[PDB]
């Protein structure tokens, strides 16, 4: 006989089933995996099926195990001969199987909170059907959520495709001063439309005529255009979440003129687990499992439906998570004491307005405090920012709901203003620069749509609100996201992107201009060859040669609406002159591997360029011991090997823009080191450098009725100085092809804060090396935002498709 | 039917045993790689482990022997020995003068030469006791003749399943066949721990699957009537760090590929030349530490001969162990070369005893172990004697402080006791008369006579010198013969060794508000007229000396009355031979830090002396060993301490001055006294930076301390023995965060 329904029982029989067996070898001969592998085994097998219940056992194949809800993985498949969805082998979903009733599949945006990237990546074998979405999907490592990277603006912006400072929701807590009201989830004005700005994709469905059922989501049970979903819950997080995934189960089966064709669905998990036990807790852990079983529950249900084969699901989080700690809390009382007249927002990415509502805040002086606060102790872990100094990778800048005084912080840091206005310092947080790999977090697509196991780099949130709209079928509001960036995760792409054309014609400058005295004493080691004029009769239709040589992936574009440009060719680099504003909008070039460049001193001697109308800013009397500014080149100048001597072309006046001193530092270390190394490391770099303009910080270049409001007089002469400074480095992915014949691009992009000192990099102590590198890293920005904000155009000429392009052009490296 | 883990905690007060059980068993359950942290993190998803834990008694860290590697500890545990002593040194290892290698592969792991020490089954078998060891290093081998009555020889491939029958198949015995020790041996979480790393899916399996295990036991003993009637200890041998082939140091960097030398490579890696064994002894070491030290800017690794490596890691009194012995910075490893190295991405351990994640499992349940008790850390050769005195045995000669885990039982056998005074307590009359020493004293500086008459003014107040300064009992003199004087002062007690004419240890009490003299005192000594006069008290001997110098063993600056200078500080009863480069350590350390902990603790007592250990095997040294290591100076014998010991102790309550504790807080330090600071690396650092870095790394136990000095502290306080034991044990873990 079996030990089946007698483990640990009874004796009487010709064979024991109990531990005394085993030193007397009277086991029967099935007691070993009847009895004993249960305990430590969680798989179901032909000895287990309808069995004793027992306590001891991992995992049960009792009969009555439906209604406990512990069954094995394979209680269904070994026990009642028909599979889980989880379990059936992966299947390419070619066109879309779905049942008479569905004209098309339907997509799902379900969210489960605070899922970093990261928890997928480490305990990715610990949920097997989040894991098999990922290989049957379409995943990326990391998807990069919006600055700040709290709960309710990436899920706003996740469904409108807008910045925060855009679409209105800039943190979960916020106060407008034109409203003057505050904006709290615990408050009636969470329910308020004013706070909702943007086009969320519903509304968007809506306008096309397509039905919406929203379980749970920020916005959703607002009123943003008068227009609420068709389906739509108020939000209580007490609702189990059986009774979440039931609801759109149920919606899915409603007739079709009934029906929604976007659907989505939010869980607190894992998030909450993260907050009250840490990121690496066990809490973690049963959450993210309990989750995992869940988008199980989801999956069985598609499956008995006939769906599973019929919806395009997006798998998705808000933002990660990070661990906190007592010894890593900035409070502002130790440097301002206990202060009434100021409300900060405590978190990694911390905020301060003063008291009065809202009379002092705008002329409060925050510059003062910001300085104040600035550069007090050796390695501080906080750095105070007016919002338009922040990084504009950050996008964080353009709103009123934005305090003028933000707060950046290192990585597991936060600043509160004192120990009581923080939550418990202990808990896990997030909020951080969307940058820092605890903060990213999850995308997996999968379904008819998407590729099944393709694995794809990482890309912002913002880029989905264009895919689901391609997903319904929707004419998507205009947003943020590159439309066309994601076609790669697609089967068959929807939407075929193109590059923006120029707005107008170019000017010509011709050589007409008579030489006037700059002022200039050049050295004698300077080398203006009597000739040296003859260099300005060069035109870009020198074909490749020496224009292929400067611009190798096509020239800039310019898409500034009306702006009168000339290309000016000279033999190392191409420049993109702009004659409204009587200086270089970029210079292009290519620092080859064995090319050198000179550090004899070029101080005071400019080259009139004849081609370009003489300002009173391009003579060097103009600069000659100015203490308030001075000029930096968009190209350095280089060495000519077989003469060994300088291009005097880099020394023309046409290359020169006006510079801080403090910025020079920053920009020399860059050009003399940095560049020379680059080039080194990537045998041969291409450089595009230029001036940008945006004083109303709203991430775009300006208008020139903007900049003629922010052009000053410093010595008694008009000028306009730059908000920043952009470069553009680009090479070849082989390291064994040059810049000028790269099969696969390799793109850097910056975007330098032009401030008269360097109190932001708090340079006592420190040397260059290391404080000018870090410097370059945190303002790293997309090639795109620098095309936003410069009204240029890059790598058009390519080769390459233009939503491969795109990709390239919407990158960014992840901080650790 | 429930499980075992499901039946509410309950208190065993006495053994429920079957009638053919005379006594509760023990059983040494071992969990390789099995980090105190996994139970602090992953214990909500481990519910056996967690309700041996939550109704026994538990500790947050056990801290395994240095190298923190499977064999060695292991074979600590059940030996009580560091494994300088017990022979058994790593996993990997050569011997000079049986010019053989020993490797767990190898047929040389049966050979009985390398396991020294008693291990505890051969004490049971000593005294009449059977012993079933299922897995256990030792245990496959005749250490004394003796194997354990049943035992297993070592297969990995066995199932764990097999294992835990096995051994409560073993319980089931007729008594005269039945073992009253059983050891129980797993390789997980240890593998996972290697193969995917500490914090990844694959150890939360492991580590899942051995509490089910635990779990099968545990079922497994309530089935026979035993889960009231078995003493468990739940134990791991180490804990795991993750790897990385960034933090990988490889030596062939700055030697270049040679052929001359073999490294154990590791993060505790040791170094020897090739030639088997002609060339070991006389292949100039030094030169080549010397060489690999201070090469780069924040160097993760440190050549160290292996008597200069601290003291608390017990890692220098064996052949076994390569005179060239390295130190890495947690997370960090050494090779020759890259191809030498095991993958540099997997999971390792090795490291500094005291790095959190080295820090191992322990958990005792069972009718003597009390229900729901949490202590403070002890270290693994505790165990042995532990393991003793469960099973009614008396222990071997170990390491292990005999008593200093009684407050883990319910009812401890043993009651330990001090240990009594051996030296010659002779008199010091002050009888010798006033020669030039050749000082030149500031004046500044107050004479010894007036010092009295001076003193009375501002100081009147009545209260006790004697307890103001060994206000714990004065140290006790174990050292076999010899002569001390205790001689007393006014703010301290110096204990004087007539053999070497020099203080053995002065006791002091810095209050928080005693004021700290900033005066300039060079070259300057009053002759204590108590004790002979030796050519090395004289300031002429030290005069413009390059070789060496001399320092107080209490600060002259500490002075309770004044802004003055202590005068009796300068007594020549006060003073030891010291580097010049040594005193920059010591000067900080009384100067600014002193001070600071003075503040910090509502004062602060300090025992300071000089140490002998010349054969470093961690003893004080013989008599004969210290005449072998004098040395002449300025054509004048002089004997030079090996290391400079300091024990700190104030009170737990702040409230309370160090002088009226409660409770005392105790930290102890053995300072390596070495001629330059090459140590250190100091170039680009500050002192306060590197000194500090250099007394925690030399931090030590005050057992530790006792051991090497002949001294016995507290011996007056109010607490128990066994109280007192913990105290002196204990050793701060260095905290990765
Ligand atoms: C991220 O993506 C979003 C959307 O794609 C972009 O946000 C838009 O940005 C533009 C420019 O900042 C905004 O356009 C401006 O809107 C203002 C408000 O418009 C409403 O209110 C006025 C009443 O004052 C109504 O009359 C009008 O019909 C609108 O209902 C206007 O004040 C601005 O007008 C200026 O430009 C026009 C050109 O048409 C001039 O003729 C005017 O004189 C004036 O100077 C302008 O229209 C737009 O509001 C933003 N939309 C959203 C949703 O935020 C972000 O720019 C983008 N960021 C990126 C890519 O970095
Ligand atoms: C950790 O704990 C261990 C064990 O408790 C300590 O190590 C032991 O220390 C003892 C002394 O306490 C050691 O004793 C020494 O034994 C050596 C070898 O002895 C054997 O061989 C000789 C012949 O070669 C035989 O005659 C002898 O009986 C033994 O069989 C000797 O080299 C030593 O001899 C010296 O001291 C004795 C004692 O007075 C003199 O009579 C001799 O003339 C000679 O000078 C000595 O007897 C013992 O080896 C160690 N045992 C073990 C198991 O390691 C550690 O010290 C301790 N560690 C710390 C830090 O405290
Ligand atoms: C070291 O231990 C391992 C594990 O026990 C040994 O491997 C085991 O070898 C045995 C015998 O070769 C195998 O046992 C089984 O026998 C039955 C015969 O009816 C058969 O049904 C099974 O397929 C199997 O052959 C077994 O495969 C294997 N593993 C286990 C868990 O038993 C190994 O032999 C040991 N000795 C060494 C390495 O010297
Ligand atoms: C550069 O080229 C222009 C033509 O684009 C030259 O222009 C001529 O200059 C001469 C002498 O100054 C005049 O007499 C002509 O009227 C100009 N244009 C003609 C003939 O087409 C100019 O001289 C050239 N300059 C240099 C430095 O080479
Ligand atoms: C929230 O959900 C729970 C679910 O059981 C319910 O009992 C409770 O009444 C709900 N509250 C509101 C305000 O809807
Ligand atoms: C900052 O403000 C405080 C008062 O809040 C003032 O005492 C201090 O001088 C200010 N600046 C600095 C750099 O300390
Ligand atoms: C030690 O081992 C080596 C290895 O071959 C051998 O050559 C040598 O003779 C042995 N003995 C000595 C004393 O070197
Ligand atoms: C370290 O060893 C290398 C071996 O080539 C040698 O070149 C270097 O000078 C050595 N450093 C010393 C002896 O200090
Ligand atoms: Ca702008
Ligand atoms: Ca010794
Ligand atoms: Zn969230
Ligand atoms: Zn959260
Ligand atoms: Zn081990
Ligand atoms: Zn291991």
């Not at 610990?126 to 995943?139: A, M």
């Not at 609406?561 to 210079?587: E, I, N, R």
């Not at 890293?777 to 410069?790: K, N």
Request: aromatic share 12%; with cysteine.
């Amino acid at each position: 006989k079996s030990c089946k329904g007698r483990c640990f029982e009874r004796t009487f029989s010709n064979c024991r089933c109990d531990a005394a067996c085993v030193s007397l070898g009277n086991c029967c001969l099935d007691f070993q995996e009847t009895c004993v592998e249960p305990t430590h085994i969680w798989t179901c097998n032909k000895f287990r099926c309808g069995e004793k219940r027992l306590s001891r056992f991992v995992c049960s194949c009792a009969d009555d195990c439906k209604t406990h809800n512990d069954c094995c993985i394979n209680y269904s498949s070994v026990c009642q001969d028909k599979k889980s969805w989880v379990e059936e082998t992966c299947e390419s979903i070619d066109t879309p199987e779905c049942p008479a009733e569905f004209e098309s599949p339907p997509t799902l945006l379900f969210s489960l909170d605070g899922f970093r990237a990261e928890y997928l990546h480490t305990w990715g074998g610990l949920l097997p059907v989040i894991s098999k979405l990922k290989n049957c999907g379409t995943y990326t490592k990391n998807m990069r959520p919006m600055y700040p990277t709290k709960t309710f603006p990436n899920h706003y912006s996740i469904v409108t495709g807008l910045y925060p400072e855009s679409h209105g929701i800039i943190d979960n807590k916020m106060y407008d001063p034109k409203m003057n009201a505050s904006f709290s989830l615990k408050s009636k004005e969470k329910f308020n439309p004013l706070w909702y700005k943007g086009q969320p994709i519903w509304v968007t469905a809506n306008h096309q005529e397509v039905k919406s059922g929203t379980y749970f989501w920020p916005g959703s049970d607002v009123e943003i255009d008068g227009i609420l979903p068709d389906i739509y819950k108020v939000y209580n997080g007490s609702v189990p979440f059986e009774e979440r995934i039931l609801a759109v189960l149920e919606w899915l089966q409603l007739p079709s003129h009934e029906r929604p064709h976007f659907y989505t669905l939010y869980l607190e998990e894992p998030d909450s687990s993260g907050h009250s036990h840490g990121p690496v807790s066990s809490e973690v852990i049963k959450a993210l499992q309990k989750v995992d079983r869940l988008v199980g529950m989801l999956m069985d249900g598609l499956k008995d439906l006939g769906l599973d084969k019929c919806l395009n699901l997006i798998l998705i989080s808000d933002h990660g998570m990070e661990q906190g700690s007592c010894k890593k809390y900035v409070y502002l009382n130790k440097y301002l004491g206990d202060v009434n007249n100021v409300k900060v927002v405590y978190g990694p990415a911390a905020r301060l307005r003063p008291t009065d509502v809202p009379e002092t805040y705008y002329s409060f002086n925050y510059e003062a405090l910001a300085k104040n606060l600035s550069c007090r102790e050796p390695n501080q872990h906080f750095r105070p920012y007016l919002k338009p100094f922040l990084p504009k990778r950050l996008h964080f800048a353009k709103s009123d709901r934005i305090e003028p005084l933000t707060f950046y912080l290192d990585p597991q840091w936060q600043l509160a203003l004192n120990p009581s206005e923080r939550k418990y310092c202990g808990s896990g947080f997030h909020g951080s620069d969307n940058l820092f790999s605890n903060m990213q977090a999850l995308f997996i697509g999968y379904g008819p749509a998407f590729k099944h196991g393709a694995e794809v780099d990482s890309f912002e949130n913002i880029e989905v609100y264009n895919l689901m709209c391609d997903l319904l079928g929707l004419i998507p509001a205009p947003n943020n996201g590159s439309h066309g960036s994601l076609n790669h995760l697609l089967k068959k792409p929807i939407y075929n992107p193109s590059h923006p054309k120029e707005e107008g014609f170019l000017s010509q400058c011709p050589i007409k201009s008579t030489s006037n005295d700059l002022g200039c004493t050049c050295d004698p080691w300077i080398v203006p060859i009597k000739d040296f004029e003859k260099q300005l009769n060069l035109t870009t239709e020198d074909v490749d040669d020496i224009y292929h040589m400067t611009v190798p992936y096509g020239r800039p574009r310019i898409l500034l609406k009306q702006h009168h440009v000339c290309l000016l060719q000279q033999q190392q680099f191409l420049t993109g002159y702009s004659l409204d504003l009587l200086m270089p909008l970029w210079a292009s070039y290519t620092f080859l591997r064995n090319d050198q460049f000179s550090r004899d001193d070029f101080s005071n001697c400019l080259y009139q360029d004849l081609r370009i109308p003489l300002s009173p800013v391009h003579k060097c009397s103009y600069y000659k011991s100015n203490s308030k500014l001075s000029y930096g080149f968009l190209t350095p100048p280089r060495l000519n090997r077989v003469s060994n001597h300088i291009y005097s072309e880099a020394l023309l006046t046409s290359n020169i823009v006006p510079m801080y001193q403090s910025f020079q530092v920053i920009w020399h270390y860059l050009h003399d080191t940095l560049l020379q190394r680059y080039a080194h490391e990537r045998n041969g770099i291409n450089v595009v450098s230029g001036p940008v303009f945006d004083f109303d910080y709203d991430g775009r270049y300006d208008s020139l009725e903007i900049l003629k409001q922010n052009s000053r007089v410093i010595r008694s002469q008009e000028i306009l100085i730059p908000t920043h400074f952009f470069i553009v480095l680009t090479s070849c992915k082989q390291l064994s092809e040059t810049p000028l014949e790269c099969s696969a691009l390799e793109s850097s992009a910056y975007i330098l804060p032009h401030r008269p000192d360097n109190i932001e990099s708090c340079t006592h102590g420190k040397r260059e090396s290391s404080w000018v590198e870090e410097l370059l890293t945190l303002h790293r920005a997309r090639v795109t935002d620098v095309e936003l904000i410069t009204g240029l155009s890059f790598y058009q000429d390519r080769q390459e498709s233009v939503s491969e392009l795109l990709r390239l052009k919407t990158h960014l490296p992840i901080f650790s």
